[PDB]
């Protein structure tokens, strides 16, 4: 459908906002990132493609923390994701200043959804070219959400985005089938690494670095922390072992 896709706020005769649909095409080109909701927290994993050996390992972090209990991972236009996360940090700080409590994840997800959606209202602005998997632990459990360029978001047992989303979603579905009682935080980290490695088979042309993050009540006391050192290497070893 041409003619109606040159502007951001225009409905096509079918009611479809094409520019937002084109923004989704930007997301589908990004590196695959997933989020797994465990029985007491959430786990985030992102594939970081190694463009060249000259990138210093472990410095180009792509998972972001908001306040202290929300972690955000996104795929698509990385600058757009940072713009969205910068707003979330402002929204989270504003909520804490006025209400004194850390912003609830369902409340935070709405704050971001209103912002992302507001970018589809006017033709003087462009839609976000990122789908953001975000979540954390709040007063009433763990929450995992996923935004879209249109501003739509839902709660997920496990979310996947980026180029390997179709591959990753297959293994996320297997996790919920095999573990309906709830997956443990430590096992979720190992499974998160395995899913990213499997999803990378859609990007075999280039090497990648796995980055994991997670926020569990029992293990981080409800705060968002990165996987590093021994725990990261066990996940990498497990992911390679299953691949081999």
């Amino acid at each position: 459908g041409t003619g109606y896709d040159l502007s951001n706020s225009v409905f096509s005769p079918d009611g479809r906002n094409f520019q937002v649909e084109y923004a989704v095409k930007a997301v589908e080109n990004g590196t695959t990132s997933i989020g797994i909701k465990c029985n007491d927290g959430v786990v985030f994993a992102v594939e970081k493609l190694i463009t060249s050996k000259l990138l210093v390992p472990q410095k180009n972090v792509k998972i972001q923390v908001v306040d202290r209990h929300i972690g955000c991972v996104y795929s698509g236009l990385i600058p757009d994701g940072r713009h969205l996360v910068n707003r979330g940090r402002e929204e989270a700080a504003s909520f804490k200043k006025l209400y004194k409590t850390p912003i609830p994840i369902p409340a935070f997800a709405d704050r971001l959804g209103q912002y992302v959606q507001a970018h589809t209202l006017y033709n003087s602005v462009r839609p976000f070219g990122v789908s953001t998997i975000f979540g954390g632990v709040d007063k009433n459990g763990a929450h995992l959400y996923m935004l879209e360029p249109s501003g739509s978001y839902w709660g997920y047992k496990g979310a996947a985005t980026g180029k390997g989303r179709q591959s990753a979603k297959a293994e996320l579905e297997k996790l919920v089938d095999h573990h309906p009682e709830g997956l443990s935080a430590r096992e979720a980290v190992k499974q998160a690494a395995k899913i990213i490695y499997l999803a990378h088979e859609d990007n075999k042309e280039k090497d990648f670095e796995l980055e994991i993050s997670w926020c569990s009540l029992s293990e981080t006391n409800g705060l968002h922390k990165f996987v590093k050192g021994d725990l990261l290497q066990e996940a990498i070893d497990f992911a390679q072992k299953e691949i081999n």
Binding site: L98, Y99, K100, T101, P106, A107, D110
Partner: protein
């Protein structure tokens, strides 16, 4: 005035006299100083009547807006909203507030917000002009986790002395009992508490 809030085993009781004075004249002798800012969050107002009423109206609007968006607030959140208004306008609004509320997880909570705009969580709180005369009595007699009957008897004794010694305090004693069973309103007339 004389406002008071006492946590007890099943929840929290807010209490106050009913007299408001403009000098020696009692402008209204049956005032209701207990204000509902949310279903199970109530506040006691002392100081300027215009300022406290304005703050209570704005806080109720904020907590109503909070509930529609982020679920039911806690008593700590209600006190936080009070602090921002009382603190960000401390040079204009001469308001001292006692916020008491009930929620299932934390049971009864009491927050006092003195004239400065700071927030203090307390087992029991007393404010108003008449409170100064019962600082010693309340401290000696307050106990943790008293029953509803003991707390009401404790509050009746406390306010009867605050009413006795303060000219700017008197009238009927109005209580609001916040518990899991709901909100209960009690009133005690001078013939009931004056000869305790």
């Amino acid at each position: 005035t004389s406002i008071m809030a006492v946590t007890f085993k099943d929840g929290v009781i807010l209490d106050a006299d009913s007299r408001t004075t403009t000098g020696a004249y009692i402008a209204n002798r049956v005032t209701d100083k207990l204000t509902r800012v949310h279903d199970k969050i109530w506040c006691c107002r002392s100081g300027s009547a215009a300022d406290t009423q304005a703050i209570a109206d704005i806080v109720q609007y904020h907590l109503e807006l909070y509930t529609s968006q982020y679920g039911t607030p806690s008593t700590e959140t209600a006190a936080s909203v009070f602090k921002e208004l009382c603190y960000e306008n401390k040079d204009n609004l001469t308001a001292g507030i006692i916020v008491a509320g009930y929620d299932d997880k934390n049971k009864g909570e009491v927050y006092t917000i003195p004239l400065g705009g700071s927030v203090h969580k307390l087992p029991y709180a007393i404010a108003g002009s008449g409170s100064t005369f019962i600082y010693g009595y309340c401290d000696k007699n307050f106990r943790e986790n008293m029953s509803k009957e003991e707390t009401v008897d404790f509050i009746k004794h406390s306010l009867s002395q605050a009413i006795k010694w303060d000219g700017s305090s008197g009238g009927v004693i109005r209580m609001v009992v916040l518990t899991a069973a709901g909100v209960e309103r009690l009133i005690f007339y001078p013939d009931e508490y004056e000869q305790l």
